[PDB]
Design a protein around this ligand. Structure first.
Ligand SMILES: OC[C@H]1O[C@H](O[C@H]2[C@H](O)[C@@H](O)[C@@H](O[C@H]3[C@H](O)[C@@H](O)[C@@H](O)O[C@@H]3CO)O[C@@H]2CO)[C@H](O)[C@@H](O)[C@@H]1O
Ligand SMILES: [Ca+2]
Ligand SMILES: [Ca+2]
Length: 543
């Protein structure tokens, strides 16, 4: 059945890096308000804003110390209320980031929990006595080091999947769950339009927290088999839905690593799924194009079978830039557009991450002091102590680190690319002199205007929202081609995902080119497409 959230195009803002309105180098809510014309003109329907709640910022808002107050760096609740009012008067919607696997260690519940074994908040978090004079088990944090941190006062360890300042909440405690549901409903009562639900596949821990294998005798071992998508999680997520989301006309997208296309039914089926869609991570870990076709096609066909719906994306605040990960910096403009048509025109709701629509790319800062990510700074400290060299650590940070997606948004060629009049919290990528909103708005051939046109064709042609996906030319190691079919219309999406010229055989009573990123050759025959590197074309056929 048709739904507003299926038809939408979403845009993800990382507010610390979107727009600084007051010169302190930190993006803020009045900065977002000042750029709403940009998003409305792009054609965005839904804005997902990353966390904006009170936080010490050990993990840039994902360590929350008050769920009901706004981060001071970003503004006040009055600024939030102005943002939501202006978004809604522009006919757009706003979803917030719901972070309920863990809190800050400065949240009042944790300050109480850590104070005594008998404090009434003790069991709001995950506490355990050590084993053999060390931690309760051998589990590694996702941000490196142990997943357990010792409290000298009470002589027990608390669990943190993420940073030492992000103690995990104990979802086995009914009192925790009840306080969380009241908080979620307090936000929904304000008239927000839903949530992106952070780290939500991590809320169930294997009981007893058993050690995992360690044949290499590492200090700690990766611990996803102890806490990622574990049996028992669905009971908690079904109750979360019944007590909160199901009471409101909203959209939910869960961040759900560890879910595969054949295990997705309980997450996203129309009949009984806990969210409307999830971010799945199987495609985010020459490029093996056939492997990518396999993953994305498994999710297109798999969710069509269960009446689920895909969240389509190639970028977010936790990944490197998609030109580097999936395209080519030697063909930056052409590959940015080719990737855009490829991912955006599958069946699902597309998400655009800030700067993806400009073709922004990874940065390379010379010094570890120029980086911020708690995960990579802890990785550096831990690996340096083990004897890894500075150079080998920097290669990991430069090639894989999510700070590549957190540099200031590139609005123009003024100081700091127009993101701030002060000293940005993270330096601007030097390539803003070439890559910026102002230059792209005036260039018909820009990446930005290619995204504007994708959004327009998807809105104008129902086949691009609701049409059935089918993979074409599966064994072609260069060409990713697929169709969308609805009634008497078929759209053909052709993407030459290679840095070479290629030829491709086109797979009706009328044919139209809907978008293309190279000039068309009038002598070219439809039958024998001669594609340039990273050339994409979308055709609409009337059957
Ligand atoms: O609030 C903490 C943290 O949560 C969100 O992202 C984290 C994911 O929840 C978490 O699973 C982990 O992702 C890893 C995948 O599990 C793994 O399969 C593969 O993709 O590598 C990832 C290593 O991180 O980590 C991410 C954080 O990187 C949230 O969106 C983050 O901003 C936040 O820091
Ligand atoms: Ca600011
Ligand atoms: Ca040609």
């Amino acid at each position: 059945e048709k739904k507003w959230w299926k038809e939408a195009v979403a845009y993800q803002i990382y507010p610390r890096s979107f727009m600084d309105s007051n010169g302190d180098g930190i993006g803020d809510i009045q900065g977002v308000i000042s750029k709403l014309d940009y998003l409305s003109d792009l054609g965005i329907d839904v804005i997902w804003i990353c966390p904006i709640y009170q936080s010490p910022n050990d993990d840039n808002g994902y360590d929350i110390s008050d769920y009901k107050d706004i981060m001071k760096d970003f503004g006040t609740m009055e600024d939030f209320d102005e943002l939501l009012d202006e978004v809604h008067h522009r006919g757009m919607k706003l979803i917030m980031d719901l972070v309920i696997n863990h809190t800050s260690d400065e949240h009042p519940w944790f300050l109480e929990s850590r104070s005594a074994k008998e404090n009434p908040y003790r069991d709001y978090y995950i506490w355990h006595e050590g084993k053999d004079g060390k931690e309760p088990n051998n589990w590694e944090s996702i941000f490196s080091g142990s997943a357990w941190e010792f409290d000298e006062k009470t002589k027990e360890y608390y669990m943190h999947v993420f940073s030492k300042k992000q103690p995990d909440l104990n979802w086995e405690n009914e009192k925790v769950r009840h306080e969380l549901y009241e908080m979620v409903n307090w936000w929904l009562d304000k008239g927000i339009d839903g949530f992106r639900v952070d780290a939500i596949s991590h809320i169930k821990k294997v009981a007893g927290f058993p050690d995992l294998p360690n044949p290499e005798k590492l200090d700690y071992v990766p611990s996803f088999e102890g806490h990622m998508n574990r049996p028992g999680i669905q009971e908690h997520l079904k109750e979360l839905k019944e007590k909160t989301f199901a009471k409101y006309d909203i959209m939910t997208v869960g961040q759900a690593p560890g879910v595969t296309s054949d295990s997705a039914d309980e997450w996203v089926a129309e009949d009984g799924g806990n969210f409307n869609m999830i971010f799945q991570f199987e495609h985010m870990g020459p490029l093996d194009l056939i492997e990518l076709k396999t993953i994305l096609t498994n999710w297109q066909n798999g969710l069509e079978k269960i009446n689920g719906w895909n969240a389509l994306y190639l970028e977010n605040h936790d990944q490197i830039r998609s030109v580097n990960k999936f395209g080519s910096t030697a063909y930056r403009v052409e590959s940015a557009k080719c990737l855009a048509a490829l991912y955006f025109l599958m069946k699902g709701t597309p998400f655009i991450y800030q700067g993806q629509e400009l073709g922004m790319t990874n940065v390379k800062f010379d010094s570890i002091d120029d980086y911020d990510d708690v995960g990579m700074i802890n990785y550096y400290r831990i690996q340096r102590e083990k004897g890894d060299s500075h150079d080998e650590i920097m290669k990991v940070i430069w090639e894989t680190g999510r700070d590549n997606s957190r540099t200031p948004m590139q609005w123009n060629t003024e100081k700091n690319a127009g993101f701030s009049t002060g000293n940005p919290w993270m330096k601007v990528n030097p390539n803003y002199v070439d890559i910026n909103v102002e230059e792209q708005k005036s260039d018909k051939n820009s990446v930005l205007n290619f995204y504007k046109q994708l959004i327009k064709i998807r809105k104008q042609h129902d086949v691009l929202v609701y049409g059935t996906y089918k993979l074409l030319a599966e064994e072609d190691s260069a060409i990713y081609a697929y169709t969308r079919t609805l009634e008497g219309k078929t759209a053909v999406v052709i993407c030459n995902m290679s840095p070479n010229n290629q030829t491709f055989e086109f797979p009706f009573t009328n044919i139209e080119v809907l978008i293309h990123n190279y000039p068309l050759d009038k002598n070219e025959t439809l039958e024998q497409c001669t594609l340039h590197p990273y050339e994409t074309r979308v055709y609409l056929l009337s059957l």
